[PDB]
């Protein structure tokens, strides 16, 4: 499982990073 | 085993293959047991007592031949054997002026930072006794306030052998910043202020200042030249980069943090 | 016996109640924030870690015979903690051994039995993953023992308990190092022992074994984890390079590890002070005295803590090495009233022109001066005796003759005047220049500080500082 | 280096520019601090 | 006292300098910060037989200072004397920078194999397959399949 | 283990740390969106 643990935590980086960019668009839009 | 111990010891040392044989002796010293911790067998420090002494005279050989990069190579290996990691160190008498040779090597080369970090290790050794350290620190207590060529008025007190090779550097390292300070706002002086006060009424010291420096004695003066600048300013060279700070100010202040 | 007999029942239950429950809540809450709280870089038990700095130094020292603290250690070291049924057995044992303390006798472990008590953290399916829990349970053999300040024959068992705790570094570095960041808890534990293992190695010889240990213990920083572990060991690295009197100090300057960016306003405050003495011995003063002043005002928030006594001592020593004249007792303490009295006389003779009076006091009070670790003042204080006078004149007179500044300084003659007017400019004392037409020493005035861009240079750091606080605030806010 | 080269021949911590600034009038202003609101 | 031992020019002290290079190899690596050229010029000696061993102790000192690429480039040029030395927890950090530099080089060369390829150092891959041999001999093969995807080979 | 597992086991550390980090950063941004969305809806 040890190679899979290294790959899946990489996949939990940018899939979690795009949510960070997402709320920046949300909170900027809700001020309008 | 004790290769040519006191052959050319006292009188002279003109031999050149002696040093490789002396290094050949030093091949044996680092290869008997060890040098770095020198933990056990205290008798293996007993040739290291004499391995101190053969580098002492090796430093005396370097001061005979005026070898500055060797004289620090000997002294550092000696001091790191005066800082043997088993520091028991039975007292040799030639240590206290060898450090005085180190303390005058180092004082004459603008190592005043190296001076005042050296004195930390010997609190009462450097003061209460040891005239070979008491004289270079009374030199340094002279070297605080106004006594730097009053030093030359106290030149004639050498407790050891001549010490000439490092009072000549002390001759050198004073008379050149003397020449540096007269290039500065000490603007110009006549020949007789260079005579009575620098020192030594006229030898080829006038050849020293006219050739190492300029300051040609023309009609009754040493003459200074131009030592000024123009001082330009633009203050809109920052107007590209001060705008870079202002854009950065509203950058982080507007971003959703 | 009638007088001392009735005074026996009240002393046990006050440690048996509140000293019982505090680590019982801490060892529970940090465990729940070791299992949960994946972002436990800053636990709230880090303030309890700061409480355990203050707690056991005053709460308990001895194991409190008449059976109060003597039963805590066989309770709290008997922890196997298998699963929820076999931890609730131990959760009953927090209650059940309280009857063993009160009704029965406790298990008296007089300074020796705690080391074989470290087999109950192996007996009957114990836990090795809870290296915070066993790491605190490796501090607890020290906590009555070391903090009682015995320093007597259990120093070797202080050492062997720490070797078991250095074997817990091995269990951190080899046994299941899975993302728990427990080193930043263990480094403060590696601090606590090595404040007294520092003192232990002050009761004995040098530390070159620990030097090989400390460099390797510093080595695993900056790659694995780096917060406050690099910092606290670096003061422990510096303090005995300083305490030993060798060259020792340019090694510190090239030790380019100065910057773990914060140390919670306590370790970073003294860190500036240890390196402030380092930069002072190589004759740099103005750069030294400004971080001397920075270290005094950074964390002084106690009453005469002991190194506050020392930074306030050394601060105007180097300011009496430039020659500005502040003196001392404007912030005086009851632990300072004794320690000011030789230092009292030291700074008054700077302003006056009497030096045999100064050489009287140095001969009078040299033993206290040598106790302070300030041997090398006199090789450079007689320097500043005439430097304080010449700066005071140059600050007074705007255009002074050489022929007058001498005779005021009881200096007899207009040559002995500018026997102090050619290195002071080179040392950065006075702006003034000297013409060899008049021999007069005149300085000028600074006006362009507001006329040219001095203010907006200084503002750009402080604009950048204030926005960081706004950034540290919003990032650390919405935890609900 | 450079001899500065020449031809010719209590405990008053800025509490002294406080205390040598201080010697002849106010000692009956040390608990003379309170008598002034019925006449003056 | 140990720095100035690297000044002398006879070869009988050069092979005794390495007898004193591995002597002082333990602790005072901060002191060797001022001794960069005294390893480097000693590395430029071809009459010095063990010049790769000078790159061993150089990869020791630039790891102390944190010159991680400079330790990496001298782990390259240290040849067989570095290739024989891989049983430590010192060397596991500098092979970590190796594989990291290796797999980003291989994806770079997998982008454009049609000309202007950056040639991989053979001593860079000399420890790559050698550490892959440790996968073959330490019984573990989920690790042996693990690099084999990431190496892009 | 030191040559073939430690290259991965030390590397999955920081891959765990950033996912550990930005989850705190995410739920801060989550609650701020719920404040404004409850403000606009009302």
Swiss-Prot record, chain A:
The listed locations are:
Cytoplasm; Nucleus
Ranges in a coiled coil: none
> Which superkingdom is the protein from?
Eukaryota
Described purpose of this protein according to its UniProt entry: Component of the 26S proteasome, a multiprotein complex involved in the ATP-dependent degradation of ubiquitinated proteins. This complex plays a key role in the maintenance of protein homeostasis by removing misfolded or damaged proteins, which could impair cellular functions, and by removing proteins whose functions are no longer required. Therefore, the proteasome participates in numerous cellular processes, including cell cycle progression, apoptosis, or DNA damage repair.
User: Member of which family?
Assistant: Belongs to the AAA ATPase family.
Subunit text: Component of the 19S proteasome regulatory particle complex. The 26S proteasome consists of a 20S core particle (CP) and two 19S regulatory subunits (RP). The regulatory particle is made of a lid composed of 9 subunits, a base containing 6 ATPases including PSMC4 and few additional components. Interacts with NR1I3. Interacts with PAAF1. Interacts with TRIM5. Interacts with ZFAND1.
Recorded protein name is 26S proteasome regulatory subunit 6B
Q: Which organism is it from?
A: Homo sapiens
Gene that this sequence comes from: PSMC4
Swiss-Prot record, chain C:
Q: Keywords for this entry?
A: Isopeptide bond, Phosphoprotein, Proteasome, Ubl conjugation
| Residues covered by the PCI domain | 269-448
Show the InterPro entries listed in the entry: 26S_Psome_reg_C (IPR013586), CSN3 (IPR050756), PCI_dom (IPR000717), TPR-like_helical_dom_sf (IPR011990), WH_DNA-bd_sf (IPR036390)
Carrying Phosphoserine, the residues are 401, 413
Tell me the SUPFAM superfamilies matching this sequence.
Winged helix' DNA-binding domain
Q: Which residues form a coiled coil?
A: none
- Please give the SMART domains that the UniProt record associates with this protein: PAM (SM00753), PINT (SM00088)
Sequence position, cross-link Glycyl lysine isopeptide (Lys-Gly) (interchain with G-Cter in SUMO1)? 21
Give the span(s) annotated as Disordered: 1-52
Q: Its Gene Ontology molecular function terms?
A: enzyme regulator activity
How is this protein annotated for GO cellular component? Answer: cytosol; extracellular exosome; extracellular region; ficolin-1-rich granule lumen; membrane; nucleoplasm; nucleus; proteasome accessory complex
Give the GO terms filed under biological process for this record. Answer: proteasome-mediated ubiquitin-dependent protein catabolic process; regulation of protein catabolic process; ubiquitin-dependent protein catabolic process
Q: Where is this cross-link: Glycyl lysine isopeptide (Lys-Gly) (interchain with G-Cter in SUMO2)?
A: 21
Q: Does the keyword Phosphoprotein apply?
A: yes
**Pfam families in alphabetical order:** PCI, Rpn3_C
Q: Which PANTHER family match?
A: 26S PROTEASOME NON-ATPASE REGULATORY SUBUNIT 3, 26S PROTEASOME NON-ATPASE REGULATORY SUBUNIT 3/COP9 SIGNALOSOME COMPLEX SUBUNIT 3
Q: How does it assemble?
A: Component of the 19S proteasome regulatory particle complex. The 26S proteasome consists of a 20S core particle (CP) and two 19S regulatory subunits (RP). The regulatory particle is made of a lid composed of 9 subunits including PSMD3, a base containing 6 ATPases and few additional components. Interacts with UBQLN1 (via ubiquitin-like domain). Interacts with ERCC6.
Q: Which family does it belong to?
A: Belongs to the proteasome subunit S3 family.
Q: What is this protein called?
A: 26S proteasome non-ATPase regulatory subunit 3
Organism name:
Homo sapiens (Human)
UniProtKB/Swiss-Prot annotation, chain E:
Q: Which residues form a coiled coil?
A: none
| Source species, domain of life | Eukaryota
Q: Which family does it belong to?
A: Belongs to the proteasome subunit S1 family.
Q: What does this protein do?
A: Component of the 26S proteasome, a multiprotein complex involved in the ATP-dependent degradation of ubiquitinated proteins. This complex plays a key role in the maintenance of protein homeostasis by removing misfolded or damaged proteins, which could impair cellular functions, and by removing proteins whose functions are no longer required. Therefore, the proteasome participates in numerous cellular processes, including cell cycle progression, apoptosis, or DNA damage repair.
Query: Subunit structure, briefly?
Result: Component of the 19S proteasome regulatory particle complex. The 26S proteasome consists of a 20S core particle (CP) and two 19S regulatory subunits (RP). The regulatory particle is made of a lid composed of 9 subunits, a base containing 6 ATPases and few additional components including PSMD1. Interacts with ADRM1. Interacts with ZFAND1.
Q: What is this protein called?
A: 26S proteasome non-ATPase regulatory subunit 1
What broad taxonomic lineage does this protein's source fall under? Answer: Eukaryota, Metazoa, Chordata, Craniata, Vertebrata
Query: Its gene?
Result: PSMD1
Q: Fragment boundaries within the full protein?
A: 7 to 159 of 953
Curated annotation (Swiss-Prot), chain F:
Give its localization: Cytoplasm; Nucleus
User: Taxonomically, which superkingdom?
Assistant: Eukaryota
Family label? Belongs to the AAA ATPase family.
What job does this protein perform? Component of the 26S proteasome, a multiprotein complex involved in the ATP-dependent degradation of ubiquitinated proteins. This complex plays a key role in the maintenance of protein homeostasis by removing misfolded or damaged proteins, which could impair cellular functions, and by removing proteins whose functions are no longer required. Therefore, the proteasome participates in numerous cellular processes, including cell cycle progression, apoptosis, or DNA damage repair.
| Quaternary structure and partners | Component of the 19S proteasome regulatory particle complex. The 26S proteasome consists of a 20S core particle (CP) and two 19S regulatory subunits (RP). The regulatory particle is made of a lid composed of 9 subunits, a base containing 6 ATPases including PSMC5 and few additional components. Component of a complex with USP49 and RUVBL1. Interacts with PRPF19. Interacts with TRIM5. Interacts with NDC80. Interacts with PAAF1. Interacts, in vitro, with the thyroid hormone receptor (in a thyroid hormone T3-dependent manner) and with retinoid X receptor (RXR). Interacts with ERCC6.
Name recorded for this polypeptide: 26S proteasome regulatory subunit 8
Source species: Homo sapiens
Q: Could you read off the lineage of the organism from its UniProt record? A: Eukaryota, Metazoa, Chordata, Craniata, Vertebrata
Range covered out of full length:
17 to 58 of 406
